[PDB]
Amino acid sequence: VKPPRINGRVPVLSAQEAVNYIPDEATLCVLGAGGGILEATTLITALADKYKQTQTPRNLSIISPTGLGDRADRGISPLAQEGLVKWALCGHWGQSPRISDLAEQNKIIAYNYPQGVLTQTLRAAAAHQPGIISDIGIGTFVDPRQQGGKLNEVTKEDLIKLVEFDNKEYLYYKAIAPDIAFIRATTCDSEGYATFEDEVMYLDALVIAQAVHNNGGIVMMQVQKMVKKATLHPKSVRIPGYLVDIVVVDPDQSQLYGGAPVNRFISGDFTLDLPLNQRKLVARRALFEMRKGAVGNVGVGIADGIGLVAREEGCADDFILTVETGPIGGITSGANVNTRAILDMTSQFDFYHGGGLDVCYLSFAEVDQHGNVGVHKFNGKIMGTGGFIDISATSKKIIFCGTLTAGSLKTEIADGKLNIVQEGRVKKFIRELPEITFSGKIALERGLDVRYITERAVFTLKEDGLHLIEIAPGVDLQKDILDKMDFTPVISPELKLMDERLFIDAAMGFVLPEA
Amino acid sequence: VKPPRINGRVPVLSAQEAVNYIPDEATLCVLGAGGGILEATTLITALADKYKQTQTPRNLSIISPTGLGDRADRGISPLAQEGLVKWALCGHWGQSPRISDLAEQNKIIAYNYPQGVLTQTLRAAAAHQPGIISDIGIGTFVDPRQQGGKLNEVTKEDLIKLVEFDNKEYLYYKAIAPDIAFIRATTCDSEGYATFEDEVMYLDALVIAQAVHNNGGIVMMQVQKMVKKATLHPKSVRIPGYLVDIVVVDPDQSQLYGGAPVNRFISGDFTLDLPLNQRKLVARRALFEMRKGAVGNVGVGIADGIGLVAREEGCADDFILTVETGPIGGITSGANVNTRAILDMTSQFDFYHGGGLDVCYLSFAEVDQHGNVGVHKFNGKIMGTGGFIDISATSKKIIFCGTLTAGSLKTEIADGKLNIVQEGRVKKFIRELPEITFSGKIALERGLDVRYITERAVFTLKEDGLHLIEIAPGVDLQKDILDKMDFTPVISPELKLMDERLFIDAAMGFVLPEA
Amino acid sequence: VKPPRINGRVPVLSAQEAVNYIPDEATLCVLGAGGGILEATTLITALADKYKQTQTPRNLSIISPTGLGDRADRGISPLAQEGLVKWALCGHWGQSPRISDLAEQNKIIAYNYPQGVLTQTLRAAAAHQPGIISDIGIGTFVDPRQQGGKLNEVTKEDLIKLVEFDNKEYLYYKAIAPDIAFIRATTCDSEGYATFEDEVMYLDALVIAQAVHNNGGIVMMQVQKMVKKATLHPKSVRIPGYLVDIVVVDPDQSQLYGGAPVNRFISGDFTLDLPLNQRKLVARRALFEMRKGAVGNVGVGIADGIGLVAREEGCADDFILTVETGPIGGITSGANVNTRAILDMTSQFDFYHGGGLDVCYLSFAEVDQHGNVGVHKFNGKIMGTGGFIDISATSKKIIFCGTLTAGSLKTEIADGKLNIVQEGRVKKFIRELPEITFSGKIALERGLDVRYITERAVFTLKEDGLHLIEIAPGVDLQKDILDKMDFTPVISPELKLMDERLFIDAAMGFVLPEA
């Protein structure tokens, strides 16, 4: 039941009025990424308030392609009131940890499709295709021979199955269509035609709207303002009006959390005119893996300052970094500026899945003797994948970046050497992962080049296991490396000290290898 | 003494650092209109603060083409500190009343050129022309045969002289060049090239910059942000960078007073989709003077709601209203939206001076027996002219609007009738104006049609004085009109009652005549 | 007699239909610059054709602010049919030489105001000002003590008079208002509101429209296309619709002569990514006169390749060149691209008149013993001034560029020397000019630095006449310089050879002096 359009005009309602149209057991899809990016905050707030006041609606299913929130009480954390949500499928879980908490405690059914696969299944749902065939996820916890993407013990129903085509294994992921959408844009006309001129990016707003619309659902869109019918540039319109059922106008809508005014550099409308610590060390060694002409991706973690190090070395313009949510290029002057392009998120993942990335840089929580990497669960807590599986599945060079030990490791770089001031108290290189986010065996089968970079050592994955290929100056092999791991790596016959320039507090004069 | 450019880059300073470059006895020209429009607030604040702290700099001369401020302590009122300013030439004095107070008390030398003539003289100063020849002002206080534009008794030097060309009278206004400019834009590149994309209008920013630059002065410009060299659209750049000496960046610069975020309807970037009181009555009768296809101007005051009345009557698109500061057309949804064009202020006044307006609607403070109107001084207070003289000098039809009496005048409309519940304590129709803002004699000599509209009576100017042509129903000629004026009007043989439709609280069914 | 507007829509007519509204003896003002820039070609064509067929209208007066045409039969040359034009006032006469031919033969009345002053007088006429006061022209043929800007014997009426303000000499130029305008834009809406998005520049279209409109005239505008009412961006509209009386739509309208399709680099919408001969030699020496941060102007002629020379030496981004018709900066890849800004022409001339140019480069036809320069008439032919007087009157450094002799002068730069292969038959440095375009005496009174650069010699103007300051290597002082002049220059005690690098066919390693 949806409010009728009067003379073609899209119904405009308060967020409180809009959420009254959500029935019990509805499947709700929520647009947005971390830190307020493209989040219909007034709709989430209104829903959470209605449940707080009336204990309705009940037993909702949530689909969240990307993780919303601030790793605390924002994002969809407000929907984690018991009885409101019964079932969730999310691409990243760590961003709204109150929902994660419900999953950890077996209070909701909980699934993690790889974020890119998730958005592709919503696009499949829009076209009434039953599911998608992808080899993204084979050999990991998403594989039905492992956990089938199920995050807790109460989750039982199989959404993923093994299929075979052209003498190769694939996973078939079931496509689930939502009943309700909370989407957002900058502006729409009186009929619902929407533009994204001030938004940080596009994500999968159109795909979400199509999936809900073609499932007989209700699309609710938050905007900053409305304009006269047919006055927006048709090539700037990203969502056609006939896909939108209800519009909520929030004049104070901001690009990100924090209530900062609109920044037109972030909009893309204008062109904007480092201590040697542990982080800069790892970022510098990570840069050694870049080649001229390479298309790369850098995940959040110890290496995510590689762009700034590249700038210092004078080679930032020699390669291009993309972000899985859609932005291509740009600089950090919680959003980049001077981007070169913004693609929709589903199209970006299509590119990643077919091995478009020459190199990726990813954090790890644990690494085992088979070269497997665990990231989706940490110390009991559900973190989820994000784009981790979508990126590490087929990228040509996979560069894992982290420390060798965890738990307040403190290191100092002095006199061209590494000095371990305070050792970590937890091993990260362990015998066997409890659950796998990246499969060493599959990466080798796919012919991928896998590196593990730490502050004190560098490894490469080979058929016989991890090879130790580099050691930092100032570090002892036995006490500082071997004694701090729970398996024995192969020691490379070509074992060398890590490059001297890495440990000097001056410009390296580093030249990127040719294309 | 100006800060040098380094590699062609315009010097960027704090407002505090910038105002240090102002010497004693400098001529300061300040850009801006009422309510914050294009006001370089951080520079005004910085100068006022320097004086408050150090009693320097001393004995400045101020030129203010338009009136800045809120009719209180904002605008250039903070510069009214004793000894800071010794001489001022302004187009509109009432908007910054603390400076007007100095003039009233003979503490500063004080002049009032018509606002349009003033901006034209600054343009002449840019070109090193000694002054301009115009008949705007003949017969008014601006005329040397009256007060020569001098606002008090202490002001003695003649700036204006009477001259003759082609056997016709004209005034010669001396052009005065400023030494320092406080200007403002939205955005500039690293070399100072500036765009006005978020500003309400343009005013005379380029004129002021050229006048100061060609006088060997210092142009200081406030902007919201700066961008990379040569990235702005060349057809959007209004001020070339070589005219700019110092830039001050104020990230929180707002379009108007009150700190509201940028409104993109006000910017001109998007298209936006009445009690029968005394003000509505006068506006309604004023609308009777409008013709199909007319170009008009509406001043601030009793009839400034005429746009909304025309919208109610369904004839708003049948004429066009222009504003002397530049905007053409638009609607009131702190500024207008859906404008049709924005001209620079000086070009707008060129249009007005040559008789471009078919009709204008202006408020009056007093009217005398000759049809002279007084506006620039009332009750000993200096208001100044604004555009009043530029508009009432040559417009084809001049419609003065106000009340017959003032001071607690209480009126009510009942049964299509006017009832004066409480009379005003002061008469506005007097024997003789002390100072003239508009000459009845000159208007008749120019062949102009002059009307005076009040709530209870309508007059027309003829060679033998004001003719009473219309009376409100419910009003007695003798005791409500004649006894309430300090002079004897001619009573028209064609005297009739004011249209009954004006006094009915419903749509009039009024259609605009076409000449 | 104008076609009436229907429901506010501007009348749209064919060019043939439009020109029928021009009465006998009308004063016609024609917008445009050289080579088709902003020219309403269909209107010029239709008028010439109406006259060819009907011998009406008769005895028109022409005002041409800038020079139109291709220095041959285009521009307003088609209007040079006997009896069509009786009177003309043009800023630049050589661009349409068929009309100049009529002037030379005493068949029309013929005046030349400096181009900048001419556009200022049109702006005065819009405001009903009788004329303008300017010292631009003092001591030249425009001065009424010389020719009063009269170009032939049949021109008698005085339009310019000498006046005095503040003990300084000025000229008063009478403002003449036109009756008909031929203007042009890219696009207008149904009400006549016009934008210039594809035009090369703006010239003075608004000024011309206002002048004609306020004189009760008829403004006729050619456009490429028309769009729905109120759909153009208000900050892009340059001409308000109420100024336009008739629109002619020419879908084939091109940016310049020659019928090439629209070039969006010329529009300003996109950013675009030398033989050692006589011209390059003079341009190289002219470049020595530039300084970092200087604002310059380069006139048509031998030195007009100085931009390309600066680019070869890598210093093009260190200064800025402006063009009197409005464009600021840019490069030659028929018009420039990558411009930094476009001003309206009248505003540009205001800037020049006030001494805004640090340096200018101008061609000469003849130079006399007092340092006077002649350009406006040569060999009986009327060339006119263009912006020559506006630029050479107050620019801080004036650099005249030409050859010492003319008439099949053949020269070659070989072996780091100048070799005069064939000497020019005509001397350009003569005793006395018959008419003066630039006064040496006035330049020295105004404190200006005046240089004369030829291929073989460089001079500077001093109180005692021309000082020879440099000689080319390979040239004999007596036979190649002194013998080829009709007067004796002072030979500088600091006389030197022209820089060796000028004559070598390799990059000079020239470095611009600091600001």
Coordinates of N, CA, C and O in Angstrom, one line a residue, chain B residues 120 123 126-133 161 165-166 170 172 174 189 191 193 196-199 202 206 210 213-214 229-230 233-235 237-238 240 242-243 267-269 292 295 317 320 322 328 339-343 347-348 350-351 353-356, chain C residues 7 120 123 126-133 161 165-166 170 172 174 189 191 193 196-199 202 206 210 213-214 229-230 233-235 237-238 240 242-243 267-269 295 317 320 322 328 339-343 347-348 350-351 353-356:
Chain B
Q120 N 28.9 55.1 -11.4 CA 29.4 55.7 -12.7 C 30.7 56.5 -12.5 O 31.6 56.5 -13.4
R123 N 33.6 54.2 -12.1 CA 34.0 53.7 -13.4 C 34.8 54.7 -14.2 O 35.8 54.4 -14.9
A126 N 38.3 54.8 -12.8 CA 39.1 53.7 -13.4 C 39.8 54.1 -14.7 O 40.9 53.7 -14.9
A127 N 39.1 54.9 -15.5 CA 39.6 55.3 -16.8 C 40.3 56.6 -16.7 O 40.7 57.2 -17.8
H128 N 40.6 57.2 -15.5 CA 41.2 58.5 -15.3 C 40.4 59.6 -15.9 O 41.0 60.6 -16.4
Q129 N 39.1 59.5 -16.0 CA 38.3 60.6 -16.4 C 38.0 61.5 -15.2 O 37.8 60.9 -14.1
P130 N 38.0 62.8 -15.3 CA 37.9 63.7 -14.1 C 36.5 63.7 -13.5 O 36.3 64.0 -12.3
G131 N 35.4 63.3 -14.3 CA 34.1 63.2 -13.7 C 33.1 62.9 -14.8 O 33.5 62.7 -16.0
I132 N 31.8 62.9 -14.5 CA 30.8 62.6 -15.4 C 29.7 63.7 -15.5 O 29.4 64.4 -14.5
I133 N 29.1 63.8 -16.7 CA 28.1 64.8 -16.9 C 26.7 64.1 -17.0 O 26.5 63.3 -17.9
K161 N 29.1 70.6 -10.0 CA 28.8 71.9 -10.5 C 27.8 71.8 -11.7 O 27.6 70.8 -12.3
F165 N 25.3 71.9 -21.9 CA 25.7 71.3 -23.2 C 24.4 71.2 -24.1 O 23.4 70.8 -23.6
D166 N 24.6 71.6 -25.3 CA 23.5 71.5 -26.3 C 22.3 72.3 -25.7 O 21.1 71.9 -25.9
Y170 N 23.0 70.4 -17.1 CA 23.5 69.1 -16.6 C 24.4 69.4 -15.4 O 24.8 70.5 -15.2
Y172 N 27.9 68.3 -13.4 CA 29.2 67.6 -13.5 C 29.5 67.1 -12.1 O 29.6 67.9 -11.1
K174 N 32.3 65.3 -9.8 CA 33.7 64.9 -9.8 C 33.9 63.4 -9.5 O 33.2 62.9 -8.6
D189 N 41.1 31.5 -8.3 CA 42.2 30.6 -8.5 C 43.4 31.1 -7.8 O 43.4 32.2 -7.2
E191 N 45.9 32.6 -8.8 CA 46.4 33.9 -9.3 C 45.4 35.0 -9.1 O 45.7 36.1 -9.5
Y193 N 42.1 35.1 -10.1 CA 40.9 35.1 -11.1 C 39.7 34.6 -10.3 O 39.7 33.5 -9.8
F196 N 31.7 34.3 -9.2 CA 30.7 34.8 -8.3 C 29.5 33.7 -8.3 O 28.3 34.1 -8.1
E197 N 29.8 32.4 -8.4 CA 28.8 31.4 -8.6 C 27.7 31.3 -7.4 O 26.6 31.0 -7.7
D198 N 28.2 31.6 -6.2 CA 27.2 31.5 -5.0 C 26.7 32.9 -4.5 O 25.9 32.9 -3.6
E199 N 27.2 34.0 -5.1 CA 26.9 35.3 -4.7 C 25.4 35.6 -5.1 O 25.0 35.1 -6.2
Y202 N 26.3 40.7 -8.5 CA 27.7 41.2 -8.8 C 28.0 42.6 -8.3 O 29.2 42.9 -8.1
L206 N 33.9 44.6 -10.2 CA 35.0 44.9 -11.2 C 35.3 46.4 -11.3 O 36.5 46.7 -11.4
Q210 N 39.0 48.0 -10.5 CA 39.7 48.7 -11.6 C 40.1 50.1 -11.1 O 41.2 50.6 -11.4
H213 N 43.0 49.8 -8.5 CA 44.2 49.3 -9.2 C 44.8 50.4 -10.0 O 46.0 50.6 -10.0
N214 N 44.0 51.2 -10.8 CA 44.6 52.3 -11.6 C 44.9 53.5 -10.9 O 45.4 54.5 -11.5
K229 N 45.1 27.0 -10.3 CA 45.3 27.9 -11.4 C 44.6 27.5 -12.7 O 44.8 26.3 -13.1
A230 N 43.8 28.4 -13.3 CA 43.3 28.2 -14.6 C 42.3 27.0 -14.7 O 42.2 26.4 -15.8
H233 N 35.9 28.3 -15.4 CA 35.4 28.6 -16.7 C 35.6 30.1 -17.1 O 35.2 31.0 -16.3
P234 N 36.4 30.4 -18.2 CA 36.7 31.8 -18.5 C 35.5 32.7 -18.6 O 35.6 33.8 -18.2
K235 N 34.4 32.2 -19.1 CA 33.2 33.0 -19.1 C 32.4 33.2 -17.8 O 31.5 33.9 -17.7
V237 N 34.5 33.9 -15.0 CA 35.4 34.8 -14.3 C 35.0 36.3 -14.4 O 34.9 36.8 -15.5
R238 N 34.7 37.0 -13.3 CA 34.3 38.4 -13.4 C 35.4 39.3 -13.0 O 35.3 40.5 -13.5
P240 N 39.6 39.6 -13.2 CA 40.9 39.1 -13.6 C 41.9 39.2 -12.4 O 41.9 40.2 -11.7
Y242 N 45.0 39.9 -12.0 CA 46.0 40.9 -11.9 C 45.5 42.2 -11.2 O 46.2 43.1 -10.9
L243 N 44.1 42.3 -11.0 CA 43.6 43.4 -10.3 C 43.6 43.2 -8.8 O 43.4 44.1 -8.0
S267 N 21.8 31.1 -5.6 CA 22.9 31.1 -6.5 C 22.5 31.1 -8.0 O 23.3 31.5 -8.8
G268 N 21.2 30.7 -8.3 CA 20.7 30.7 -9.6 C 20.8 29.4 -10.4 O 20.6 29.3 -11.6
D269 N 21.2 28.4 -9.6 CA 21.6 27.1 -10.2 C 20.4 26.1 -10.4 O 20.6 25.1 -11.2
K292 N 0.7 45.7 -19.5 CA 1.3 44.5 -20.2 C 2.6 44.9 -20.9 O 2.6 45.8 -21.7
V295 N 8.4 47.3 -18.1 CA 9.6 47.1 -17.3 C 9.5 48.0 -16.1 O 9.4 49.2 -16.3
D317 N 3.5 37.2 -14.8 CA 4.4 37.0 -16.0 C 4.1 38.0 -17.2 O 4.7 37.9 -18.2
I320 N 7.8 42.7 -16.2 CA 9.1 42.3 -15.6 C 9.6 43.4 -14.6 O 9.7 44.6 -15.0
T322 N 12.7 44.8 -12.3 CA 14.2 44.9 -12.3 C 14.6 45.5 -10.9 O 13.8 46.3 -10.3
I328 N 17.3 40.7 -12.5 CA 16.1 41.0 -13.3 C 15.1 39.8 -13.1 O 15.5 38.7 -13.4
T339 N 15.5 34.0 -10.9 CA 15.7 35.3 -11.6 C 15.9 35.0 -13.1 O 16.2 33.8 -13.5
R340 N 15.8 36.0 -14.0 CA 15.9 35.8 -15.4 C 17.3 36.2 -15.9 O 17.8 35.7 -17.0
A341 N 17.9 37.1 -15.2 CA 19.3 37.6 -15.5 C 19.8 38.4 -14.4 O 19.0 38.9 -13.5
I342 N 21.1 38.5 -14.3 CA 21.8 39.4 -13.3 C 22.8 40.3 -14.1 O 23.8 39.8 -14.6
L343 N 22.5 41.6 -14.1 CA 23.5 42.5 -14.7 C 24.4 43.1 -13.6 O 24.0 43.0 -12.4
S347 N 25.8 49.0 -15.2 CA 25.0 48.8 -16.4 C 23.5 48.9 -16.2 O 22.8 49.4 -17.0
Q348 N 23.0 48.4 -15.0 CA 21.6 48.6 -14.7 C 21.3 50.0 -14.5 O 20.3 50.5 -15.1
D350 N 22.9 52.6 -15.9 CA 22.9 53.2 -17.3 C 21.5 53.1 -17.9 O 21.0 54.1 -18.4
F351 N 20.9 51.9 -17.8 CA 19.5 51.7 -18.4 C 18.5 52.6 -17.7 O 17.7 53.2 -18.5
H353 N 18.9 55.5 -16.1 CA 19.2 56.9 -16.4 C 18.7 57.4 -17.8 O 18.2 58.5 -17.9
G354 N 18.7 56.5 -18.8 CA 18.1 56.9 -20.1 C 16.7 56.6 -20.2 O 16.2 56.6 -21.4
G355 N 15.9 56.4 -19.1 CA 14.5 56.3 -19.2 C 14.0 54.9 -19.5 O 12.9 54.7 -20.0
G356 N 14.8 53.8 -19.2 CA 14.4 52.5 -19.5 C 13.2 51.9 -18.7 O 12.5 51.1 -19.2
Chain C
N7 N 1.9 37.9 -26.4 CA 2.0 37.2 -25.1 C 3.4 37.2 -24.6 O 3.9 36.2 -24.0
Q120 N 32.7 53.9 -25.1 CA 32.3 54.7 -23.9 C 31.2 55.7 -24.2 O 30.3 55.9 -23.4
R123 N 27.9 54.0 -24.4 CA 27.4 53.7 -23.0 C 26.9 55.0 -22.4 O 25.8 55.0 -21.7
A126 N 23.3 55.6 -23.9 CA 22.4 54.7 -23.2 C 21.8 55.4 -21.9 O 20.6 55.3 -21.6
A127 N 22.7 56.1 -21.2 CA 22.3 56.8 -20.0 C 21.9 58.3 -20.2 O 21.6 59.0 -19.2
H128 N 21.7 58.7 -21.5 CA 21.3 60.0 -21.9 C 22.3 61.1 -21.4 O 21.9 62.3 -21.2
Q129 N 23.6 60.7 -21.2 CA 24.6 61.7 -21.0 C 25.1 62.3 -22.3 O 25.1 61.6 -23.3
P130 N 25.4 63.6 -22.3 CA 25.6 64.3 -23.6 C 27.0 63.9 -24.3 O 27.1 64.0 -25.5
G131 N 27.9 63.5 -23.5 CA 29.2 63.1 -24.0 C 30.1 62.7 -22.8 O 29.7 62.6 -21.7
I132 N 31.4 62.4 -23.1 CA 32.4 62.0 -22.1 C 33.6 62.9 -22.2 O 34.0 63.4 -23.2
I133 N 34.3 63.0 -21.0 CA 35.5 63.8 -20.9 C 36.7 62.9 -20.7 O 36.7 62.1 -19.8
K161 N 35.5 68.7 -28.6 CA 36.0 70.0 -28.2 C 37.0 69.9 -27.0 O 37.0 69.0 -26.3
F165 N 39.6 70.8 -16.8 CA 39.2 70.4 -15.4 C 40.4 70.2 -14.6 O 41.4 69.5 -15.0
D166 N 40.4 70.8 -13.4 CA 41.6 70.7 -12.5 C 42.9 71.1 -13.1 O 43.9 70.4 -12.9
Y170 N 41.5 68.3 -21.4 CA 40.7 67.1 -21.7 C 40.0 67.4 -23.0 O 39.8 68.5 -23.5
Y172 N 36.2 66.7 -24.9 CA 34.8 66.3 -24.7 C 34.4 65.7 -26.0 O 34.4 66.4 -27.0
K174 N 31.3 64.2 -28.0 CA 29.8 64.1 -28.1 C 29.3 62.7 -28.2 O 29.9 61.9 -29.0
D189 N 16.0 32.7 -25.3 CA 14.7 32.1 -25.1 C 13.6 32.9 -25.8 O 13.8 33.8 -26.5
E191 N 11.5 34.9 -25.0 CA 11.3 36.3 -24.6 C 12.5 37.2 -25.0 O 12.4 38.4 -24.8
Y193 N 15.8 36.8 -24.0 CA 16.9 36.7 -23.0 C 18.0 35.8 -23.7 O 17.8 34.7 -24.0
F196 N 25.7 33.8 -24.6 CA 26.8 33.9 -25.6 C 27.8 32.7 -25.5 O 29.0 32.9 -25.7
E197 N 27.3 31.6 -25.1 CA 28.1 30.4 -24.8 C 29.1 29.9 -25.9 O 30.1 29.4 -25.6
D198 N 28.7 30.1 -27.2 CA 29.6 29.7 -28.3 C 30.3 30.9 -29.0 O 31.1 30.6 -29.9
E199 N 30.0 32.1 -28.6 CA 30.6 33.3 -29.2 C 32.1 33.4 -28.8 O 32.4 32.9 -27.7
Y202 N 32.4 38.9 -26.1 CA 31.1 39.7 -25.8 C 31.1 41.0 -26.6 O 30.0 41.6 -26.8
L206 N 25.6 44.5 -25.1 CA 24.7 45.1 -24.1 C 24.6 46.6 -24.2 O 23.5 47.2 -24.2
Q210 N 21.3 48.7 -25.2 CA 20.8 49.7 -24.3 C 20.7 51.1 -24.9 O 19.7 51.9 -24.7
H213 N 17.8 51.1 -27.5 CA 16.6 50.9 -26.8 C 16.1 52.3 -26.1 O 15.0 52.7 -26.3
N214 N 17.0 52.9 -25.4 CA 16.7 54.2 -24.7 C 16.6 55.4 -25.7 O 16.3 56.5 -25.2
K229 N 11.2 29.6 -22.8 CA 11.3 30.7 -21.9 C 11.8 30.2 -20.5 O 11.4 29.2 -20.0
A230 N 12.8 31.0 -20.0 CA 13.3 30.9 -18.6 C 14.0 29.6 -18.3 O 14.0 29.1 -17.2
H233 N 20.5 29.6 -17.8 CA 21.1 30.0 -16.5 C 21.1 31.5 -16.3 O 21.7 32.2 -17.2
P234 N 20.5 32.1 -15.3 CA 20.4 33.6 -15.2 C 21.8 34.3 -15.2 O 21.9 35.4 -15.7
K235 N 22.8 33.7 -14.6 CA 24.2 34.2 -14.6 C 24.9 34.1 -16.0 O 26.0 34.6 -16.1
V237 N 23.0 34.8 -18.8 CA 22.3 35.8 -19.7 C 23.1 37.1 -19.7 O 23.4 37.7 -18.6
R238 N 23.4 37.6 -20.9 CA 24.1 38.9 -21.1 C 23.2 40.0 -21.5 O 23.5 41.2 -21.3
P240 N 19.1 41.1 -21.4 CA 17.7 40.9 -21.0 C 16.8 41.1 -22.2 O 17.0 42.0 -23.0
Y242 N 13.8 42.3 -22.8 CA 13.1 43.5 -23.0 C 13.8 44.5 -23.8 O 13.3 45.5 -24.3
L243 N 15.1 44.3 -24.1 CA 16.0 45.1 -24.9 C 15.9 44.7 -26.4 O 16.3 45.5 -27.2
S267 N 34.8 28.3 -27.7 CA 33.7 28.6 -26.8 C 34.2 28.8 -25.4 O 33.5 29.5 -24.6
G268 N 35.3 28.2 -25.0 CA 35.8 28.3 -23.6 C 35.4 27.1 -22.7 O 35.7 27.1 -21.5
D269 N 34.8 26.1 -23.3 CA 34.3 25.0 -22.5 C 35.2 23.8 -22.2 O 35.0 23.0 -21.3
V295 N 51.2 42.9 -17.2 CA 50.0 42.9 -18.0 C 50.3 43.6 -19.3 O 50.6 44.8 -19.3
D317 N 53.8 31.6 -19.2 CA 52.9 31.6 -18.0 C 53.4 32.6 -16.9 O 52.8 32.8 -15.9
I320 N 50.8 38.1 -18.5 CA 49.5 38.0 -19.1 C 49.3 39.0 -20.2 O 49.5 40.2 -20.0
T322 N 46.5 40.8 -22.7 CA 45.0 41.0 -22.9 C 44.8 41.6 -24.3 O 45.7 42.0 -25.0
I328 N 41.2 37.7 -22.1 CA 42.4 37.8 -21.3 C 43.1 36.5 -21.3 O 42.6 35.4 -20.9
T339 N 41.7 30.7 -22.7 CA 41.7 32.0 -22.2 C 41.4 31.9 -20.7 O 40.9 30.9 -20.2
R340 N 41.8 33.0 -20.0 CA 41.7 33.0 -18.5 C 40.4 33.7 -18.1 O 39.8 33.4 -17.0
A341 N 39.9 34.7 -18.9 CA 38.7 35.4 -18.7 C 38.3 36.1 -20.0 O 39.1 36.4 -20.8
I342 N 37.0 36.5 -20.1 CA 36.5 37.4 -21.1 C 35.7 38.6 -20.5 O 34.7 38.3 -19.8
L343 N 36.2 39.8 -20.6 CA 35.5 41.0 -20.1 C 34.7 41.6 -21.3 O 35.0 41.3 -22.5
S347 N 34.6 47.7 -20.6 CA 35.3 47.6 -19.4 C 36.8 47.4 -19.6 O 37.6 47.9 -18.8
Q348 N 37.2 46.7 -20.6 CA 38.6 46.5 -21.0 C 39.2 47.9 -21.3 O 40.4 48.1 -20.9
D350 N 38.2 50.9 -20.3 CA 38.3 51.6 -19.0 C 39.6 51.3 -18.3 O 40.4 52.2 -17.9
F351 N 40.0 50.0 -18.3 CA 41.2 49.5 -17.7 C 42.5 50.1 -18.4 O 43.4 50.6 -17.7
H353 N 42.6 52.8 -20.4 CA 42.6 54.3 -20.3 C 43.2 54.8 -19.0 O 43.9 55.8 -19.0
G354 N 43.0 54.0 -17.9 CA 43.6 54.3 -16.6 C 45.1 53.9 -16.4 O 45.6 54.0 -15.3
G355 N 45.7 53.5 -17.5 CA 47.1 53.1 -17.4 C 47.4 51.7 -16.9 O 48.4 51.4 -16.4
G356 N 46.3 50.8 -17.0 CA 46.4 49.4 -16.6 C 47.5 48.6 -17.2 O 48.0 47.6 -16.6

